[PDB]
Amino acid sequence: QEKRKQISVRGLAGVENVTELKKNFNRHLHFTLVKDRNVATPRDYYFALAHTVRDHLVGRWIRTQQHYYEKDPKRIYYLSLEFYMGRTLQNTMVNLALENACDEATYQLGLDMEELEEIEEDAGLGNGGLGRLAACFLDSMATLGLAAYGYGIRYEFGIFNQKICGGWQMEEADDWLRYGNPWEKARPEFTLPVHFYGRVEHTSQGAKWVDTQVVLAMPYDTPVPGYRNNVVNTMRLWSAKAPNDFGGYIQAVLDRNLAENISRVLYPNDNFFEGKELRLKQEYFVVAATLQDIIRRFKSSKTNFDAFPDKVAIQLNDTHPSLAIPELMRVLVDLERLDWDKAWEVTVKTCAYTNHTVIPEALERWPVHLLETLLPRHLQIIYEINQRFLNRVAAAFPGDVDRLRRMSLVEEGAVKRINMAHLCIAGSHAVNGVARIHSEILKKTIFKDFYELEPHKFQNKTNGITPRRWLVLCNPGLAEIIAERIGEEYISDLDQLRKLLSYVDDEAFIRDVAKVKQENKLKFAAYLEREYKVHINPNSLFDVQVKRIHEYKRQLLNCLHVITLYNRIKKEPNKFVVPRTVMIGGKAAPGYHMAKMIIKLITAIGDVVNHDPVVGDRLRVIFLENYRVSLAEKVIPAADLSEQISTAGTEASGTGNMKFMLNGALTIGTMDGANVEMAEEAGEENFFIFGMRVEDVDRLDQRGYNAQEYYDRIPELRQIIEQLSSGFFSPKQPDLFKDIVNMLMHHDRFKVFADYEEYVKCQERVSALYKNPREWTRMVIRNIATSGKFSSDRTIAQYAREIWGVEPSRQRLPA
Amino acid sequence: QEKRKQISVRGLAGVENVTELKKNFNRHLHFTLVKDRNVATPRDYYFALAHTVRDHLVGRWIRTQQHYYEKDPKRIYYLSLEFYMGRTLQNTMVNLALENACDEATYQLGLDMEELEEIEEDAGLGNGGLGRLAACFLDSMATLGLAAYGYGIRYEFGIFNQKICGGWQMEEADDWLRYGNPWEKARPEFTLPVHFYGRVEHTSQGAKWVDTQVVLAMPYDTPVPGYRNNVVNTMRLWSAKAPNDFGGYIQAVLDRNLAENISRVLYPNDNFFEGKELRLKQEYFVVAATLQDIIRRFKSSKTNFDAFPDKVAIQLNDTHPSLAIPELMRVLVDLERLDWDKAWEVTVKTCAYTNHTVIPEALERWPVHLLETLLPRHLQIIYEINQRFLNRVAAAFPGDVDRLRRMSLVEEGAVKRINMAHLCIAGSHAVNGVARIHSEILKKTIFKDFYELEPHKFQNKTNGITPRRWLVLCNPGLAEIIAERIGEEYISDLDQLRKLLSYVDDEAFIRDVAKVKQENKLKFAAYLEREYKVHINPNSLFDVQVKRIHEYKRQLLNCLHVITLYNRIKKEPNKFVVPRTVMIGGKAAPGYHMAKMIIKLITAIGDVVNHDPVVGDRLRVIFLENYRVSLAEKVIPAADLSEQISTAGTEASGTGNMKFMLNGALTIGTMDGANVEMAEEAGEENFFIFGMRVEDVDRLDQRGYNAQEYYDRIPELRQIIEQLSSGFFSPKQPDLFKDIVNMLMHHDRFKVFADYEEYVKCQERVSALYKNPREWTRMVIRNIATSGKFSSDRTIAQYAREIWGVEPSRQRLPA
Ligand SMILES: O=C(O[C@@H]1Cc2c(O)cc(O)cc2O[C@@H]1c1cc(O)c(O)c(O)c1)c1cc(O)c(O)c(O)c1
Ligand SMILES: O=C(O[C@@H]1Cc2c(O)cc(O)cc2O[C@@H]1c1cc(O)c(O)c(O)c1)c1cc(O)c(O)c(O)c1
Structure with missing residues (x-):
């Protein structure tokens, strides 16, 4: 596009820099790819651009490492x-200030750089939060x-x-090295x-x-x-x-x-x-x-x-x-x-x-037998560490034998184990x-x-989270309207986003924040059509839960809410509701039967909801396939509502929560992990906080969680369990979801039913604010403006x- | 060396070509190897030169393939x-005329190009003759x-x-791709x-x-x-x-x-x-x-x-x-x-x-059961081919049922098989x-x-054999003294070597042919010291048998001859004999017990011969380890005598025979494979031909081969068998060679004893000519001069x- 080359945060297209980039692109196409423009595919063009951009790292890579040797x-x-x-391609271009120069270079060669970026494989060498951190x-x-x-x-x-x-x-198999890795x-x-x-x-x-x-x-x-x-x-x-x-x-x-x-x-x-x-x-x-x-x-x-x-x-x-x-x-x-x-x-x-x-x-x-076989010296050294450590415990707490057993690196039982956290x-x-x-x-x-x-x-x-990948790369529109008011220093000093609170009443900024979200929503919806023939209503609220599939993250609570919206439409078809596109995505561990059944329940709810002519475009539920870092960079800037609904006490921090806050989504969540600090930074009035606090969960654990109490007191909940149980969402196989029903009724460690009523009422508050575009956008400004603490520069410092x-x-x- | 840059057959070091090669070398060292001269190893320098030389192939590679598409x-x-x-490095430089320019470029950068060449791994994707062909x-x-x-x-x-x-x-394991392949x-x-x-x-x-x-x-x-x-x-x-x-x-x-x-x-x-x-x-x-x-x-x-x-x-x-x-x-x-x-x-x-x-x-x-499982359609098509083929045999030779059974693609027996040669x-x-x-x-x-x-x-x-690899690359000294008299056209028109017969009486050429062999012998001997602490006498005749280890190639006949020379020295210590360095090398198939025992017998004969103070430097026997294309390029130009001693009828062609003839060794051999055509091209007077002809082998097969007849009639042979049998060559394990003795006496399909006396007498004729340097060299000229037929350009044409x-x-x- 013509518009995207105008984005100042993407840097300068210097005439000599463009000239050299085209020369080096053509040089790599000839000497590295051994192709000419006669036979070259988009993939050859991506690789020619990647080798060209990677050449710009080399001097600095050698000089940095020499500098560490010297100093x-x-x-x-x-x-x-x-x-x-x-x-890596976009990230490299952003961090070296080459983005506009490469965009112009490739434009002059008759190529769309955004199309070449979509060819690169993710280096997907992690599962989720810990790996992305x-x-x-x-x-x-x-x-x-x-x-x-x-x-x-x-x-x-x-x-x-x-x-x-x-x-x-x-x-x-994620064969990410099929076509080589030009970076390593x-x-x-x-x-x-x-x-x-x-x-x-x-x-x-x-x-x-x-x-x-x-x-x-x-x-x-x-x-x-x-x-x-x-x-x-x-x-x-x-x-x-x-x-x-x-x-x-x-x-x-x-x-x-x-x-x-x-x-x-x-x-x-x-x-x-x-x-x-x-x-x-x-x-x-x-x-x-x-x-x-x-x-x-x-x-x-x-x-x-x-x-x-x-x-x-x-x-x-x-x-x-x-x-x-x-x-x-x-x-x-x-x-x-x-x-x-x-x-x-x-x-x-x-x-x-x-x-x-x-x-x-x-x-x-780890079983001590396994360590003794594989790493015999390591097990000897671990026992020695344990003897000296427990000597110190005994000296600090004389006669506390229970404390010695609890603190030991060695766990007794049928199988003797080493506790690696204690080590x-x-x-x-x-x-x-x-x-x-x-x-x-x-x-x-x-x-x-x-x-x-x-x-x-x-x-x-x-x-x-890094504000390079998670704002400048993925959301250049938002990075630009921010830079237009406070300049560029915030990109490595994100606390400067607090300056945006000066703009909560600024008509131009309110317009610009809403226009960027709309542009992000139009682009993501186009994708869901072009590469998956899935239609989504671009005037609907984009309600997004993306993270690994686990009982503790309670994708199932989101499922109960989605079925609640379906059932309320069927009961009062003539009543207006804020249209929603509910998007859930994430990978289940290949074993984990329950996680795989939860994915099937999401697609099954979609099968009913998405084909009900009474619902039409008022409610759509889509399972986003193959959620990974590249897809997170697409869906997060398009999101209206960020689902962060883990049982209080279970999510240590979260980081997807921070990505959504930085990119202009409002958050519905429990007081869990960093959601607590995000609510504190923005003010709780600017977050959709609901459900049991950690103290409330502990009180339930003390008297025992009885899901039956909730089923017996909540008619709308009974109707949903009865639909899952009877086979409303699996007519060809009525017992398909019996294991999910049995877990929710009898073996739910994450207390889904206990947060159901507060969750549904909180979601009505979300819909009510969405009906007021100006007030929705002003609350978004209050979130982006206070997202600065959640920079990984602050963490690393x-x-x-x-x-x-x-x-x-x-x-x-x-x- | 200064001398090697003067070799005209290696081309021009153009001032601009040298300048560009150094620039591209330094460029690859920086951008491709991501090193600087601070940390660069000889291996980085080899790779920088290989990428530089490989860049010179690319235009021609693309243009050739476009040309085939067009025409x-x-x-x-x-x-x-x-x-x-x-x-590949030297071969590429020879074929593109870059050899002197790269030599000068690397010299100016303070590097020895010959040392960088020794870093490259062989692409060893064959066993021997068929693969090298x-x-x-x-x-x-x-x-x-x-x-x-x-x-x-x-x-x-x-x-x-x-x-x-x-x-x-x-x-x-030949891990040839450990450091990558810059060519592919x-x-x-x-x-x-x-x-x-x-x-x-x-x-x-x-x-x-x-x-x-x-x-x-x-x-x-x-x-x-x-x-x-x-x-x-x-x-x-x-x-x-x-x-x-x-x-x-x-x-x-x-x-x-x-x-x-x-x-x-x-x-x-x-x-x-x-x-x-x-x-x-x-x-x-x-x-x-x-x-x-x-x-x-x-x-x-x-x-x-x-x-x-x-x-x-x-x-x-x-x-x-x-x-x-x-x-x-x-x-x-x-x-x-x-x-x-x-x-x-x-x-x-x-x-x-x-x-x-x-x-x-x-x-x-191949067993039909294996083909039926792996390739069921291929077996159906093979049977159909066989039915129609045998129909044609029956029509050409009506009632010849024996011919039908002999010609069938299908072999009957305990295990039914497909004969792939018949297919x-x-x-x-x-x-x-x-x-x-x-x-x-x-x-x-x-x-x-x-x-x-x-x-x-x-x-x-x-x-x-290609006269690029097998003369210009491996023997630039010889390629040069030839070019000095007949110019360069012979390098792709090898029949022009016949012009050298005009020089059999030329004092300068006789001097030059002998000086090149001496230079090749000094360089190879240096190597046997520097990289294996093995001493060899540079005034000895270099007697070389290099090829895969097989009974049909009769490395064992060479062993009998070597022990004969040892035993004749011990019997008459005061009698002068032409000093010899007997070099045998080649790989045995990892199964093949007999081939592995033959390698052990060569090293065992060495253990006795090489430490006998009565023999000293008059006879040395060395097993050349890891014989492969790169080692063939070193030892063949250094050889005086080429051992080509397969039982008549067993070696289809040979190609190592041709390499030796092209590089100024004389040949001792049977009338087998291409040795017949080599003797015809040069004249039999210029070859050391010995032993049974194919007709003689067939006559022995008709009456039955009795090794005992030879043992009983040849005292010198009896002494050697008795040494092997009694443990003279394995004193710590006297029965070590019982299987070799038993095979030679009772199960020898390759009639070693039948060629023993003619072989020993032929080897005396070799020694006798070696004592006359001028006549040895004139016979060498007559061999090189007639080696032109054995160009693979003639074969491919x-x-x-x-x-x-x-x-x-x-x-x-x-x-
Ligand atoms: O669907 C479109 O993009 C896809 C979705 C998407 C997104 O949501 C956010 C984002 O950062 C990038 C992004 O790249 C996607 C994409 C996929 C391709 O296969 C492709 O060739 C491309 O240029 C891009 C699209 C449609 C358009 O009509 C358009 O003009 C455009 O620039 C892009
Ligand atoms: O042993 C020497 O080379 C080795 C044997 C040899 C050969 O027989 C024929 C041939 O085509 C090349 C060849 O390369 C060998 C070699 C090995 C190395 O490790 C090396 O660094 C080198 O430069 C070379 C040597 C000694 C020398 O004194 C010398 O001057 C020299 O140039 C070379």
Whole structure:
């Protein structure tokens, strides 16, 4: 479009810059793609543009890394099993100020750059929140000029591609590397050995881990550009490779696949613990290879290990990389021959742990038999850690035997296990939750004993989202009308959005905020037609719940509300209601029967609602297939209403909530996770808060939750349960939803019925405000204006000052 | 070196060409390798040079392929399971005239280009002769301006890397793609489906192959540059990929490995038949993907199929791609719905078959049960082919029932099999052997019945070697002293080497030929020290036997001779003998116990000979480890004597014989394969011919070979057998060589003892001529001078005119 090149926030199309970009595009098309414009497909054109844009990172990537070598600042290592990065082309162009120059260059070559962007595969190397947080954090650490390295696994297959067939989830391999990855640089020369199995012999010098099987770890380095500060940091992802040397010769060559299977695929369980050996191998693989890099980089700097914590921070994203603690002790004691006590002092000052959930089924509790087989030295070191840790508990709390049993790294039972969260707290100088309410819940419930031993360890770091991906990239319309009033500094100083409260009565801004949402809604609706032949009413309220499918997130409560709207229309057909397009999307874990049945119930409700001629365009319900970072960038800027309806106490933070607030949706939600802080920043008068508070949930748990009480007292609820139970939503198979009905009536841990009436009444308040466009938009302005706290720059600046001990900086390197 | 830049055959170092090469080298080092000269290793420098040289292919590669589209000449498809390509960097620089310019460019950057060349991995995608012939053929077809495409498999692992440990072969995976392949272009956009298993339903339109498992075939295209004619042809290698859509989700993602195992590794059996299902899958994979390309390319040209043979030749390199015949019939009949008879007329005019051995254990005879399971439609079509073929035999030879049984594609027995050689002859308009004697042996023995039915089918095409790789690349010294007298035209017109017979009495040339061999011997000896701490006497005769280890090649006869020289020294220590360095190298098939014992016997003989202080530097025996194309380019130009000592009738052609003749070694050999034609070209007076002729072997077979007769009549032979038997060469394990002794005495199919006395006497004639340097060199001149027939340009020109029906051309395209 002509209009989009006019957007100032997208930078300058310098005449020489355009000329060079076209020359380099054509050069890559010829020498890199080995095509000419005769045979070139849109995919060749995307790749020619990606190689051209990637060439602009290289000088800064080399200069940044040389700068870290020269200045020797403290290095931050962000260890994660997941980096939900999404696409790279737009992000690179935004962060290097090339967006308008590439748009003009490709326009002059007769190409639509927006069409080329849609060709790129997501780097879908995460499940959801925790993975996307890692991605926002790498972006913020680069923008803040930290010497920061993401370390993870280069999965051959990311989070599965979700197809919906017959209204059911089907899973397909996410072959994201099919056409190559133009961003990464293979570093086979920096390949490192990782050891498994074997046994411990305790010799003269001490212990020795021998008779191991070797898997090599080959690093692939991806650039991470800061926002217009010429900083380019590194994400290093390890790929598994069979060792050089060794059924027959042929079978031995094919058996190289077993070692290489370690980096084959992301576990799609959204943090729910499965105890798979292959998952333990992935966790050890990332930790072992990463810590060898850290130790090597430390020794080749301006061996004595007292300075190690002054030069190294290791941030553990959940317990997934918790083996970092025993592995660093193994390296320091067995290989560097430090005394246990010195090694432990170093380890604890180096390591910090971030907890992302209180849900007990998320907790990693590895069988000791599995650890003894796979990692015999690690289990010895863990027992030693536990003995010395519990000695300290006994000394602080003499005779508190119950506290010793509760705090032990070792869990007794049929199967003896190691609690990896207890290991993380024992081995870390800082433990943080990811929202104020969550960090308090840690100190009062699941880590109370640890808090009483070492209160100074416990911190809060409220999550955030990068305002580059989550406003400038995905919503350039909104970024522009904001820049037109307060300039561009807010893009890396998001608290400046508070200036927008000066505009709540400004006729032009009220007009502009509503026009941007309408433009976003027209574009998203076009898509739902062009690529899925699905019609949506563009004058309807876009009611959006997008996140992984879990009972705790209560997609089912949204289902009860949708059926309530259908049933109220059928009862009073002549009564006006605010038209709604209810959009639910998200992946279910491939096992999880209940999650898959919930997806089927959403599509089944659609089958009835969407074909009822009495309803027509007044209510539509659509399951958004294959929800992922790229789709989030499309639907979130188009949303009117943000569904954040987890049972109070279950969602640690959320980050999708923050994306919606930044992009001009109003929120309906419980007082859970960061929804509490979002309501506080904006004022509760500007949020649709409903339902039980954490205290209310605890009171119900104390007397026992009886779903029958709610069914017996709420006629509209009885009608819906009777429709699901009798087969109104599955006439060819009347018993289809019996398991959902049985769970809701008898085994509902997330108290869906207890929030049903407050939810429905809150949703009437949403409709009532939507009927007043001007007042809807003024409340939106009050939300966008107060979304600044939820920048990951704020979050990372807190990690840097309160945990890592490094001072952030927005000052530019040269180019 | 300063001297090597002076070599005119290596071309011009133009000042602007040098300037541009350095600029492009530095550009690739920065943008492609993402390094600077601070951290760059020799391997980064090799890759920067390879990308720079590869950029020079691209325009010509695109223009050549556009030219074939424009002119629509008949296309030649060379189908092979093997392309033994070796390294590409030097070959590319020679064929584009860039060698001196890159040498000067890298010299000016402070680098040694020869050192960078040694970093490149061989593309070791073959076993030996047949694979290397495919590689010489692609080079010759490009040099002759044919519209020719090599089609094969992109094996992840080529021919195993051979280590020698304890004097034994050990096999390691040839991870040739570890650091990437800068030559190939991945073409994932041109990926094609290949079908396996399933069943045939015979419907209204006719047969339909349904319920199949799909494996995708992803092509990788490698450039094949002609010699200074601006032609760049394509080698397309298929890689196996799991189909996009589908133990659990995780196991299903890991199970993608089973389909991908099809292209994992080259079968290392040097043509010996094993009947492995995975090998049958590889053969079908290459044929099915290739024939879809051929059919598509045919339909998109200037559907009617009568012109198909005028636009397509398919050359079958051995029976490995024999399924091309039933697959083309399947496509034409089942998918294009041609009548059987029209389809068959097309298939036979399209297909031709090259036979590479008479040894019955090489013959592919697939169980019908395996074909019925894997390829049910192919087996139906093969039976139909057989019925109609045998109908024709019955009509030509009425009542010859024995001939029907002998000629059938179907072999009866405990296990019913398909004879793939019989299928190839039935389905091909031409059948060729690879040397005059071999092609006659085919018409008189194993294909006599087929010859009597269709004599016009049977041709000879004597093998050849490319004089680019096998003289200009590997022996620039020799190429230069030749160019100094007759100019450069001989490099693509090798018959011009006959001009050198004018120089047999030229003092300067005699001096120069001997100086080049000495320079080659000094360089090879340096290597045997620098990279293996092995000392060799540079004034010794370099006696070289390099080829795959097989009983038929009689490395054991060479062993008997070496022990004879040792025993004669010990008996008369004071008697002068011509010092020898006896070098034997080659890979044994990983199964093949006897081949592995023969390697151990060579190293064991070395252990005694090389440490006997009475022998000292008068006799040394070394096993050259990991013999492969790159090592052949080093040892062959250094050789004095070429060992070509196969039992008469067993070696179809040989090509290593031709390499040695071209590079100034004299030959000791039997009248076998192309040794016969080499002796004819040079004159037998200029070859060390010995032993039984084919007629002599047949006479022995008629009365029965009794090794005992030879043992009883030859004292020197008895002494050696008694040394092997008693444990003289294995004192710590006296019975080590009992199996070799038992085979030689009782089960020797290759009549080693029958050629022993003539071999030893012939070797005395070699020593006697070596004592006269001037006469040795004059006989070398007479060999090099007559080596011109053995150019693969001569061979390919015969294929083009006598089988493919296309006229070759050495005329230049524009650049
Ligand atoms: O459906 C349209 O886009 C799709 C939806 C969409 C969105 O909701 C937000 C966003 O950030 C990008 C976005 O890209 C989508 C898209 C898909 C394509 O296949 C494509 O070629 C393209 O240009 C784009 C569309 C229709 C239009 O009529 C149009 O003019 C346009 O620019 C775009
Ligand atoms: O051993 C030397 O080379 C090795 C043997 C050899 C050969 O026999 C023929 C040939 O075509 C090339 C060839 O490359 C070998 C080689 C190996 C290396 O590791 C290397 O760095 C190199 O420059 C080369 C050598 C010694 C020398 O003293 C010397 O000056 C030289 O140029 C080379």
